[PDB]
């Protein structure tokens, strides 16, 4: 009934993929208990840093990537959820289920990637475990793994970036192309699609 209807919690930043040095590694900034509390209140006063965030709901964990001052992730992870912030839940400024794409204003302290203008097809995918996977672009929204890997390896990395050799954002990791459980290619939201959504 109406009085007892529940409210879905906010997406919560629980860590980041550190790319600021010569070694890529995942950092956790909030544990599961604090994540559950923060999802319900929508108040998150933890310091945010970097370009790639690890995010979580009550039931899923995945990635989010800052590009052009917008923290982007996948609709199949975030739905229409708000994101927790120091002053309370923040509503999505972009939602496109047809692209599996959502976005919030980038948190204070985060750094944003620059959209790629290189026109280059030698890409790199960053996973939630801080693995940097070489990927050859095969189309507007597809890229092949130079070394295929079980889909278990990529699970939880949707919302992560595909980057060019110069570190520009080329797309947002959306889905794995799987055959007999082996990921030979990835599907991603092109950064141009994000730019069109922004307009
Ligand atoms: C509900 O509204 C919407 C709207 C749009 C939409 N568009 C979609 C494309 C869409 O796909 C669904 C979600 C996505 C997915 O699992 N992605 C992640 C991921 O990590 N997720 S995640 O972080 O674990 C999580 C689950 C958020 C917490 C990256 C991959 C890692 C491992 C793969 C595991 C096996 C799934 C393989 C699927 N392969 C696949 O469909 O390949 C096609 C056929 C499509 C294109 C290439 C060929 C796949 O990858 N899938 C299915 N769902 C939606 C849902
Ligand atoms: Zn580039």
Q: Give the C-alpha separation, 103 to 91, whole Å.
A: 9
Report phi then psi at 134, rounded to 5. Answer: -65, 135
Q: Which residues contact 127 (CB under 8 A, 6 or more apart)?
A: 17, 133, 153, 154, 156, 157, 160
Beta strand ranges found along the chain (DSSP E):
12-18, 25-28, 52-56, 61-67, 70-74, 94-96, 101-105, 122-126, 132-137, 142-150, 161-163, 169-179, 182-190
Q: Which residues pair with 173 in a beta bridge?
A: 188
Give the three-class secondary structure for 180: coil
Domain 114-199: state its class.
mainly beta
Domain with CATH 2.40.10.10 in the chain: 114-199
Which technique was the structure solved with, according to the deposited record?
X-ray
Residue 128 Cβ inside 6 Å of ligand 1? The answer reads no
CATH ID of 1-113, from 1.20.140.10, 2.60.40.3080, 3.40.50.1820, 2.40.10.120? 2.40.10.120
SS3 labels along 37-48: HHHHHCECCCCC
Give the three-class secondary structure for 123: strand
Q: Give the C-alpha separation, 82 to 11, whole Å.
A: 6
Q: How far is ligand 1, taken at its centre, from the CA of residue 88, in Å? A: 29
**Ligand closest to the CA atom of residue 167:** 2
Active site residue 158: yes
Query: H or E segment at 50?
Result: none
Ligand 1 nearest-atom number relative to CA 61: 28
Q: How many CB atoms lie within 10 A of CB 97?
A: 11
Q: Give the C-alpha separation, 10 to 138, whole Å.
A: 35
Resolution in Å, one decimal, please: 1.9
Contact present, 27 and 53 (Cβ < 8 Å) = no
Active site residue 100: yes
Report phi then psi at 34, rounded to 5. Answer: -60, -30
- Cα torsion through 30, 164, 66, 184, rounded to 10: -60
Domain with CATH 2.40.10.120 in the chain: 1-113
């Amino acid at each position: 009934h109406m009085a007892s209807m529940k409210k879905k919690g906010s997406v919560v930043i629980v860590g980041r993929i550190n790319l600021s040095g010569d070694t890529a590694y995942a950092q956790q900034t909030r544990g599961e208990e604090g994540c559950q509390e923060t999802s319900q209140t929508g108040r998150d006063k933890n310091q945010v840093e970097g370009e790639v965030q690890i995010v979580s709901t009550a039931t899923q964990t995945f990635l989010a990537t800052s590009i052009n001052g917008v923290l982007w992730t996948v609709y199949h992870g975030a739905g229409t959820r708000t994101i927790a912030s120091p002053k309370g839940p923040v509503t999505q400024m972009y939602t496109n289920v047809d692209k599996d794409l959502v976005g919030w204003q980038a948190p204070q302290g985060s750094r944003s990637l620059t959209p790629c203008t290189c026109g280059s097809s030698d890409l790199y995918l960053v996973t939630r475990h801080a693995d940097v996977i070489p990927v050859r672009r095969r189309g507007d929204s597809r890229g092949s793994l130079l070394s295929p890997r079980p889909i278990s390896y990529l699970k939880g990395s949707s919302g992560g970036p595909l980057l060019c050799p110069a570190g520009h954002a080329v797309g947002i990791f959306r889905a794995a192309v799987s055959t007999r459980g082996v990921a030979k290619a990835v599907d991603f939201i092109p950064v141009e699609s994000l730019e069109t959504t922004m307009r």
